Amino acid sequence: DICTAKPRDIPMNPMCIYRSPKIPEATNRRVWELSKANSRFATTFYQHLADSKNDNDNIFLSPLSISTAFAMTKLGACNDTLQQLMEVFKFDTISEKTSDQIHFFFAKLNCRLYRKASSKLVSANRLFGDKSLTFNETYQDISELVYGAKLQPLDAEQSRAAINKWVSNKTEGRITDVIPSEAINELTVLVLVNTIYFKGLWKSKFSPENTRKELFYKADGESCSASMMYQEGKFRYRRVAEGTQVLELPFKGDDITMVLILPKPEKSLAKVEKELTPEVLQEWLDELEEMMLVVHMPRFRIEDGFSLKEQLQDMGLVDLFSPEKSKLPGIVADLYVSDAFHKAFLEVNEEGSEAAASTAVVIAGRSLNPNRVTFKANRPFLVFIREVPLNTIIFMGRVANPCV
Template identity: 35%
Template sequence: MLVDLQVIFGRNMAHSKGMAFHITMVTLLTLGMMGSEVKAVEVGEHTQQLARANNAFALHLYSATRATHPDQNLFFSPLSVSTALGMTHLGARGTSSAQMSEVLRFNLLEEEHLHASFKQLNALLYESSNKYTLKSANKLFGKAGADFLQEFLDNTGNFYNSAFEAVKDFAAPEARTMINDWVAKETEDKIQNLFPDGVLNSLTQLVLVNAIYFKSNWVKSFNRDDTEPGVFRMKDETAHLPMMFKDGEVMMTDDKERKCFVLEMPYDGEDLSMLAILPWDDDGLANVEEQLSMEVLDFWDSDLEPENAMYWVPRFKLEDTFSLSSILQSMGMADAFDATKADFSGMTGDQSLHISEVIHKAFVEVNEEGTEAAAATGVTMTKRSISKRYRLRFDHPFLFLIRDRRTKAVLFLGRLVDPPHDIRVHHEEL
């Protein structure tokens, strides 16, 4: 899975105001399947508070995004958005800072602990593992000769491990190529040409980029020989998709209040897992989405139990690119985008900058592959007498999220509503 978020700043014409900065996020995820027990790890109080704040923002952003993208697939990394905007928040002051804190839910923890908590959370999430790859990279591309405050640059480096690179002219094609090449490198070439021609111009002063890359196998892989074409039912049509099959014990819950099933499918290495939320009814996704809350996430987590199930999950991949600028403004972060009101004096010492664009690009691929050796050494779940055998077919719109099992931080969030044509099985293949 790959996510890239870019924030672009430009300068405001009022003090030579009019120049902007830009934020970009890229997310790439390649997934497979497993089952395991989460490792015991000590998570600091402020780190846990930040994880919950990010989850609250994730649900708020998801709600706002689905309102502007009805009946469409969605996929994004709320953590990538929070990280890039967290770097931006370091330079925000006054009302701009207050609005950002409200929208991003940073106000759920004391500001003095905010950025240090990002540092601690990132250190925990992106620690080296030989079971999976999860890495994040941050970088600032700034206009050569611009007077960025050293304190701002030092803080982005300290709290977000972000490097700074001077750009002579953002309007030059080689500037766009340089940034796009950096993104491609950090995402294993899964995100190409992130910045289209025309996004960067002579008014651009600063580009903040966050890239997250995640690749993992399942502990217990799906058998490719069991994958067969199956019907996926949408609002007004059907499509044939390759449906993966698994039979056995899985952590799940049957949520009768929201009328959905929730399956947890952990990844190799024990730390990360996918929650797949399947509405009982073909048209039940909206009902689940409207009730999403922190309390619901907590309930699902606490109510998961080992059950015996047969389940069919489509093999799929999604790629999503969209601007978050209007969405963030509608959520209450308006001043940061207003050249007459934005206050990012913590970056330059004056109010010459505003955000001109926030671009997010994400890619996810889910397939059968897993690590059989890891499955053999995986910790087994406690067995109990099972009186029911579930048959779950993910053959209609469903929701999914990828989370860290230690902090419960939601790394990625999405839904499959309208399978892209390039993943469908065509009639001649049936």
């Protein structure tokens, strides 16, 4: 059991260790620390990601999800491979204890972010290794005990089937064909596979009988047709520094919410992206205050699938992806990382996330003031899916083009 056990009860330290030469109610000191650390990686990682993608391309990912994945291997990692892992993911800017049993506190942080009832948050993670080699039987245990499962041996394309089809089972169709038909080969050593997507309803719904057909202005200069939803009501909003508009739409339960961030018309979304930093992010989330504004927002489905390899290495995570430089004796009873794949899906509309249903919403007596605030997202804006009251960034993406 992970939700409430205790480390003292299940000795689970790594083979190698590393040494780099506003407390909320009923919250574990560590789990909090570890969490703030992830939000400092998520923003940096998002920048590099953004920077490398065209300005019309949508984005979506669960940074928390990637952090966890790599946080595993940093269990059998050693030397330069361990240093780069540690330095990159910000794992080094946290206490010694939390860092040694990092993998554990992560599981602990999950049990909670998931104990968030109501709307369900499905995920599907596993490490697939080749049968040729033999793995530590304890690595496997601390894995099945903390990372949901054990590195599943494999081999060689009925493998792509095994994988993609393994995710099929868990994501029940939602996530499929995870890896392409050109990832495995005469060099298919070790591969990471992590996928996720969120399922939830809006605390305060939108009404289908109010969805017009507005125009959306894309990054190049053109414009296109989008399904613009509409709604009148109370919301946590705030005109932050330089105009940038921040708006928070919560899901039922009030412990998970979607923060939207729309820049002015003159300032490109790209400019806003180059300023994200934990401090500036929370701060915006502090100036929020309730009001009665209108809300316009296009529907959209977003399915991002990519290799973290090129992006991480471009960040300094090079040894892990090197046959002659790697160092993961912590799983073998050497070996190296071939490629790691991530996948997130996110669909939105009148009802919420992934939530498919037809409801009605009648409001009699409401008459807002002509001098009202309106949030018309007819242009590129960022999106967050944070958890409360922890402020954990679960998904963070960008909607550059909802049309099509």
